[PDB]
């Protein structure tokens, strides 16, 4: 109960970016960034004018095993993307969308072992 309103707490989480996880072997960029677009604006380059997804491929095969990441603009778009996307159907497989770096605080973190 203080006097005066010095500014107010909020989330910081900078991370602007969204791990997601559950695609098929068929998942494009193009696919995702017409999708992930959905919520709000993917951050696309603007010297190469691409968008900032990432697909990592099997080395085995060469095809996208089904992880990615999706870099949007601000981190407001992000957070809003990830429970959007969290637990969509994508080709007929469920998407899992998480923000890339996500880890709980100290005060009250840890419960018991």
């Not at 017409?34 to 604006?41: I, L, P, R």
């Not at 603009?73 to 992000?78: H, L, Q």
């Amino acid at each position: 109960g203080s006097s005066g309103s010095s500014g107010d707490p909020d989330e910081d989480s900078d991370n602007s970016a969204i791990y997601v996880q559950g695609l098929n072997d068929s998942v494009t960029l193009d696919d995702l960034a017409d999708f992930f677009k959905q919520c709000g604006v993917v951050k696309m380059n603007k010297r190469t004018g691409q968008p900032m997804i990432h697909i990592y491929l099997d080395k085995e095969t060469g095809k996208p095993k089904g992880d990615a990441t999706v870099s949007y603009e601000d981190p407001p778009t992000a957070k809003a993307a990830v429970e959007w996307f969290d637990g969509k159907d994508f080709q007929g497989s469920k998407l899992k969308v998480s923000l890339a770096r996500k880890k709980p605080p100290m005060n009250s973190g840890p419960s018991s072992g």
